[PDB]
Amino acid sequence: AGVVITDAQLPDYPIVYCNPGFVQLTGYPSEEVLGRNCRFLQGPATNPETVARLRRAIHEGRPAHVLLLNYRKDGQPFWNDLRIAPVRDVEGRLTHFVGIQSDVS
Amino acid sequence: AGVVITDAQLPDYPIVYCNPGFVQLTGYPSEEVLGRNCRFLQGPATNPETVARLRRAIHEGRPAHVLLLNYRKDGQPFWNDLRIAPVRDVEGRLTHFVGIQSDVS
Numbered sequence A, B: 001a002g003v004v005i006t007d008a009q010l011p012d013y014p015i016v017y018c019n020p021g022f023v024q025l026t027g028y029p030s031e032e033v034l035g036r037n038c039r040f041l042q043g044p045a046t047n048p049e050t051v052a053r054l055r056r057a058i059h060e061g062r063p064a065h066v067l068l069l070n071y072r073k074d075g076q077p078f079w080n081d082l083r084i085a086p087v088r089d090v091e092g093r094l095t096h097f098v099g100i101q102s103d104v105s
């Protein structure tokens, strides 16, 4: 599965890490992912109601679990079984979010 | 795959998060994982040289990728394809580690 960790302090929530699984899934190299928001995987047939629900959860700092349509680098679509979860530190401060993508096409 | 996030500030490196995939893999519920170190998955046939190499990387704050034998709750063994990676914050401070377990038995 793809595993990404976005910095939840800077605005826009950039990716600061992606495993090899996420590079095989989407087809993007680690150098074209780091620093960008994971919304680049969306496209013309991505359901906006699923995305809106996902952006509310991220903005409220709560976990999420959705099924939205994404698009590899080659432009081929795939069902993405995304699962978001908020990470906090020792003194109770949101620092990161962990995402877990799984292809269920 | 199993995904865990250990707090890298407190000593011992406790688990502060584990996805459902990690609960299906190991067979331990989320309530018996949180607060413990992921070394509870080791057993009598776990190669100590692989574990020592893993503890050096964690202590040096560097990524790792090993293949050690673990044990589910039921006592059944499995090849664990572990992949460790260090997480840092905005002002360059190690806060967490992300682990990715995959069964390759």
Ligand SMILES: Cc1cc2nc3c(=O)[nH]c(=O)nc-3n(C[C@H](O)[C@H](O)[C@H](O)COP(=O)(O)O)c2cc1C
Pocket: A004, A005, A006, A013, A037, A038, A039, A040, A041, A042, A051, A052, A054, A055, A058, A068, A070, A080, A082, A084, A097, A098, A099, A101
């Ligand atoms: C950690 C994390 C991982 C995300 N992964 C994905 C993803 O894999 N695919 C996707 O379409 N959106 C993903 N998102 C959603 C976007 O980051 C963004 O929050 C969403 O598109 C809504 O924001 P917007 O309405 O401003 O575009 C992820 C968000 C976070 C915080």
Ligand SMILES: Cc1cc2nc3c(=O)[nH]c(=O)nc-3n(C[C@H](O)[C@H](O)[C@H](O)COP(=O)(O)O)c2cc1C
Pocket: B004, B005, B006, B013, B037, B038, B039, B040, B041, B042, B051, B052, B054, B055, B058, B068, B070, B080, B082, B084, B097, B098, B099, B101
């Ligand atoms: C984030 C993270 C995840 C880990 N996951 C596992 C695991 O799934 N299985 C395992 O046998 N050891 C795992 N370890 C290794 C132990 O946490 C520990 O570092 C290792 O057993 C060496 O420490 P020790 O020699 O003091 O026991 C993980 C370590 C970290 C930091």
